[PDB]
Amino acid sequence: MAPGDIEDMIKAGIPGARVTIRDLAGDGDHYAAEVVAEAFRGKTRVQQHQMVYNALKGNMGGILHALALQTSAPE
């Protein structure tokens, strides 16, 4: 996945989301993502994270450990 592809996939799959991606260790391998989306309001963190995994569509190997997640509804 090229730089920016994680963010692109999240925003395509969760329309309206605000996404902040940081590359842990600058390593091109493990990342952290913050995703803020109205569709998350009232959902649990487990339910919100499920929506993010869905948006990546299996394109990121090892996503369970390789994409550390923070999610919320807009403030």
* Binder of residue 24, out of Cu ion, Li ion, none (CB less than 5 to 8 A by kind): Li ion
**Segment interacting with Cu ion (CB under 5 A) among 8-16, 42-50, 52-60, 64-72:** 64-72
**Residue 53 and residue 39: Cα distance in Å, rounded?**
15
Angle between helix 5-13 and helix 45-56 axes, rounded to 10 deg = 110
Per-residue contact track with Cu ion, 3 to 42, x per CB under 5 A? ----------------------------------------
23 binds, among Li ion, Cu ion, none (CB under 5 to 8 A by kind): Li ion
* Residues pairing with 35 in the sheet: 19, 71
Q: Which is nearer to Cu ion, 31 or 40 (CB)?
A: 31
What is the rounded CA–CA span in Å between residue 2 and residue 48? 24
